[model samples]
Target chain A: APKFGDWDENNPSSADGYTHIFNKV
Target chain B: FRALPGPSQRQLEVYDQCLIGAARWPDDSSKSNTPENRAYCQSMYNSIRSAGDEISRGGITSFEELWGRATEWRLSKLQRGEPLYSAFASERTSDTDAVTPLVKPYKSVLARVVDHEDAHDEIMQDNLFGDLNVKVYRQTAYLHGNVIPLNTFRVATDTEYLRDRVAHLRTELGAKALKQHLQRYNPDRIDHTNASYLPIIKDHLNDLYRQAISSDLSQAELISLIARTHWWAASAMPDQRGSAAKAEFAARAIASAHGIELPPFRNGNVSDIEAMLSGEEEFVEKYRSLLDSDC
Candidate 1:
């Protein structure tokens, strides 16, 4: 996070992607 | 930490009754000595207790959340100092170690500073894990309850820093002097003379040195870096023997990987701590010189 300012998730989940680690197709 | 379950309104009503009966208000002395009064008091107590248990376990139907509790406890050996934050100074040297007026306190207290807090180990022991003995550590915590830093190993962000430093040191100290610090702290050989502690010693040594060379460092620089890390670990959190096992392992693993060692005579001496940091200055100088020559 420090390296890149923020994140680049297109479809961000829960405003911060706490659930993205488990997001499956 | 979180509390998933809660109490219900009915349960709170029961508690109110129990509180009334148990209270010292109006002094219910002879008035409450009768069998009927005694039975009612007991009933109210039981009702309130059962309700409480039910709410805690989420067994109540109408359970509503009361006050939520969340606590942050920074478990560590060096409570006074933060982790090594400065990146390898490719452009410059630090005015002081760890961006402070003085070397980190862990070095001041611990005889040998290692990588990832692994330098203080035998975590299965009471808390003095800096060595094989189980009694050197003591459990210290932010709360009266025990929450040891037994598992804070991944905290070592600069995994490769020590190794790189050691690689630099090797050139400055020559192979012999370079090997001196490592050899003294090296894991034992298979030789049968006083071999009981060899396996663990070797295991720890392997772990420490693997970490030492991680940052592409020469032998000497690696030694100093791990030594500084060792200082960080010893001064952090106190020991928690029964529960802090995993935390202990992570810390020990990181320390062993860095190739740091402890001295027998001193536990937490300031001069020795400063000595290690000063040695690192020499290591850094040699490292940068090598860097320039390669260019």
Candidate 2:
């Protein structure tokens, strides 16, 4: 069973399980 | 016990596998397994996938398409990226076999870049052995496929049953546990811990319980003795917040005069109140529009 969900928009990097990845290009 | 209300919104979920899985091997092999069959199967698959993907992009689909209309579900996902899946509730396995286990072409629909959710929800569509219906198909490159119960295969049926059995059970259990706690229900022995207590006093309470076992107290005396130790530990904990500490100390002093040592005080349960109140206006507006309700 796959759960479709999202990270906190304000703090994606601080979100659990997955961290927001940015290239900073 | 007070019953909990069901989800305010009716959950809308479309199970692609259930909607498209083979039933009794399709009496007409070529007729049932044509491009229409494959495309129909793929359409349902694409719906769930596309909805999820589009909603993230602020696409034009209504909320119905985004998350199947907020009906009862085994879990209510807030679109917060927090996973509703726990190891106890589901087994994670490769969906590879659903598309191609052993074949020359090896066509598979599973892709990380797209249809991730549909690609994963395939687990709910497998043959449960007992649920399998009779299917006689000629052995050919395209003729062989596992047959599933039509009742189970139908996406609508599975969605409704999922809400009733899985979602309802979880909600009912929450309310039942709350009632049990309120009534002080206990089954034999439980290691009680006052989560509100300070570490030092919690340790002292453990010591008190250990020593109490050695005392020759009556049943009623033991209960009172245990209660006394619990209160003693609770009071020993400190209140860190100055204003809260002053109020708690005053309240505890009054309770102590009444021969009742109060429970440890928590400053306020609203630790996130400030942040919650200060959310971006656009976020709140969009969230309100998406969910059709305020946070």
What TM-score fits each model? 0.16, 0.15
Question: Per-residue lDDT tens digits of candidate 1, residues B1-295?
Answer: 1222222323223322322232121212343455554445445334333443433343432201100000011122223453321211011111211111111212122222233232434322111112222212222212125332211111111224333444565566666664433322211100011122223333443454344335366646654554433332222211211111111222222223333211111112222222222332342343222111121
Candidate 2 runs further than 4 Å off: A1-25, B1-197, B232-295
The sequence of per-residue lDDT tens digits that candidate 2 reaches over residues B1-295 is 1111211122223322222221111112343346655454344333333332333233423312221211212123223454543311221122211010111111111112122221112222222111211111111111125321100011111223332333333355564443232122111011112222234343554454444333244544443443444234222312211111122222222222222322221112111111111122322232212211211
Runs off by more than 4 Å, candidate 1: A1-25, B1-215, B241-295
Q: Could you tell me which residue pairs clash in candidate 2?
A: A6-B80, A6-B81, B10-B70, B10-B71, B11-B70, B11-B71, B12-B68
DockQ category of candidate 1: incorrect
Q: Note the clash tally of each candidate.
A: 60, 7
What is the TM-score of candidate 1? Answer: 0.16
RMSD of each: 27.8, 29.7
Query: In model 1 chain B, where is the ten-residue run with the lowest total lDDT?
Result: B63-72
Best by lDDT: 1
Error of 2 at B35 (Å): 48
For every model in order, what is the iRMS? 21.2, 20.2
